Design a protein around this ligand. Sequence first.
Ligand SMILES: COc1ccc(-c2nc3ccccc3c(=O)[nH]2)cc1
Ligand SMILES: [Zn+2]
Length: 208
Amino acid sequence: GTILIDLSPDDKEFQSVEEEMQSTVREHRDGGHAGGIFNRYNILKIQKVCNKKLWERYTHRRKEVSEENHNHANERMLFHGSPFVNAIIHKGFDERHAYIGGMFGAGIYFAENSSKSNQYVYGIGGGTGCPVHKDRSCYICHRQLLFCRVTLGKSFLQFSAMAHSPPGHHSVTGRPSVNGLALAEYVIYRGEQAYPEYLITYQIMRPE
Ligand SMILES: COc1ccc(-c2nc3ccccc3c(=O)[nH]2)cc1
Ligand SMILES: [Zn+2]
């Protein structure tokens, strides 16, 4: 039941999503190994993901979490990169979309930095790169990321360099404790706590 609606580049909604994508690029400690070498993107398309059943699943869980946390869902808009982007937009997030070996346990991981999520587009560690050229820094092939509505509720704070949430919590927050420029990363342990609201198609751009 998913339909994708193209946003016009003239639409304020396109423009605000693009700005969040571009403005949250950073350099990575791997020198570009996983995600490629770039400072910015060429945004090719932004689509709204519309699915009534998946939305209702999200808002149902959101209300449950809100009621467990003094009427505060603690909702964020966060990036998600995954080889399973097509399955997610049609079927919703679930246990098959978890990062089993993640540092905060087996859960579904999201990032404030779009460039962190870009590292996962072709798999963990960038896998073998793009299917066509086997290049993790491919400047030709089209990539996709999701910009997602995520319910954090009461989040367990981990200071740092599917499973269950820690008791009495609805998510985990990975706070960077070494790299002063890194933004936070987040993990949820229930697929119903995220909705894949925007599908963004893009290329990474070669620095000049
Ligand atoms: C095996 O399938 C996987 C594995 C890892 C990820 C993933 N991990 C992240 C970790 C930190 C921040 C963002 C992300 C992120 O956006 N995606 C997605 C699918
Ligand atoms: Zn390629």
